[model samples]
Target chain A: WDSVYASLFEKINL
Target chain B: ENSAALLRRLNHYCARALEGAASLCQTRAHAEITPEHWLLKLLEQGEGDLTVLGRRYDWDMDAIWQSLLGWLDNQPRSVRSRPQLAQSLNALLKQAWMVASLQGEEHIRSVHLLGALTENPHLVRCDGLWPLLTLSQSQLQRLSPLLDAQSDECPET
Candidate 1:
């Protein structure tokens, strides 16, 4: 699975 | 699978997935923890409950997983914040909890969560799991032994 939190955390922080 | 090891693993992982979902809620700035936030997180686990269920139901989980992965891009975001439990999520957890309790299990298993997932059919769609509906009724019946749950001695009623 792709890094779930990574995506969320990255995007949300953006 | 070994009983104690299986349950202990499931308990720890389940909490992690749940915590991830909550983080998703806060990050996505959504008002409710819907399938987009919760189900996606659940599936992200390589050996999670859903993985066991994918094998059990003969699901095309590779495709299902990919579909949901893409589906995440479609979710709406907002400036609004303060996400809480969606009604659908609350019901699903309640069902899973009962399943774990009645089955004499320490934690909710893939079977329990999947059965509960089938009940909130809309949630299946939310995760792009419409295929689950085809077997929902029959599978729910078949899953009764593994998925059904109840409390031990009600309020002395």
Candidate 2:
């Protein structure tokens, strides 16, 4: 499965 | 709104979930929901309880535990930061409670959650530990009766 944290974490660190 | 109350109604493991979030934060070095964190804790916490089921089927507990640790190690990490529950884990949690309710259980238990983990396709695709274990839907169905019988001893919450 694609990381569920992937999108959520993307916005935070950007 | 009290999220805690809502979570309780849904039979979510709030403290364990939070602990998983913390573990995720520290292990990944940033905030991201990797299913392994919560899965690891759930298995670690309830492993001994599962022995009854394991004994019935003669499953290799050591191999299952080893596979779980391997997956946890393989999970991706990120920059250092606070941790949060990923949507996927939340979805899995809700599914677990739903499974419990469907089985006529008033309050969810660790066994219910363990059984429910098998229902997640995403987790399965990720090589979830349930796949590595000998448990099955039929086994889980049989387990409900045993759990319900035990619950008869407790006073209504």
Candidate 3:
């Protein structure tokens, strides 16, 4: 839920 | 290139490597580091990126590329030096692997790099470049399928 690093994880979460 | 070779290529004179170096010099920023620097370079690369993007989106590629050229033209220049990789760029490079893997690919491609850049809002907001691509939540949602559609024609690693 941390915004700072959240998008950084989007590729992995996908 | 495999993941390892791709990483190595970033260090050499590949298209991304050369464009990144040029972007670093053009921006006169910290170095050839920021994700924005690399992202702008990727836009200049010779992949079927325009085709991939155009087929799936409503944006005008001609206008976008023309505007991008203006953006490149306006960037400030700095004295030459060895560029250091930015933390954000480093993170995107590593995250791009998962983007490749999610699509059942063994190696990272330019689309994977695009995914990484668009996914990171922090980097996306840095230079107003993301707005030119018209990237948004809906656009991000469409990326995987758009990339998958192009996979069959993409060169093998």
True contacts kept of each: 0.00, 0.00, 0.00
> What i-RMS does each candidate reach, in Å?
11.4, 10.5, 12.9
Best by lDDT: 1
Ranking by lDDT: 1, 2, 3
Q: Please, what's the RMSD in Å of model 1?
A: 10.6
User: Candidate 2, B137: how far from true, in Å?
Assistant: 3.7
Off by over 4 Å in 2: A1-14, B1-6, B9-14, B17-21, B27-30, B46-49, B125-134, B145-157
Question: What would the TM-score be for candidate 2 when compared with the true structure?
Answer: 0.63
Write candidate 3's Cα lDDT for B40-97 as tens digits. Answer: 5555454444346655665555555565555645555465544555566667667766
Better of 1 and 2 by TM-score: 2
Chain A TM-score for candidate 1 is 0.33
- The candidates' DockQ values read 0.05, 0.04, 0.03
Q: What lDDT score goes with residue B1 in model 1?
A: 28
lDDT of 1 by residue, B1-157 (tens): 2322322324555546655776766766666665546666666755554554455667787677678767655666775565556666666667766666666766665456666766667655444576555555355546444322322111124
What lDDT does each candidate get? 0.55, 0.53, 0.50
By TM-score, the best candidate is 2
Question: RMSD of model 3, in Å?
Answer: 9.8
User: What is candidate 2's lDDT per residue for B19-113, written digit by digit as tens?
Assistant: 55555556566465545665455456543335445555566667766776776666666767666556665665677677767878765555655
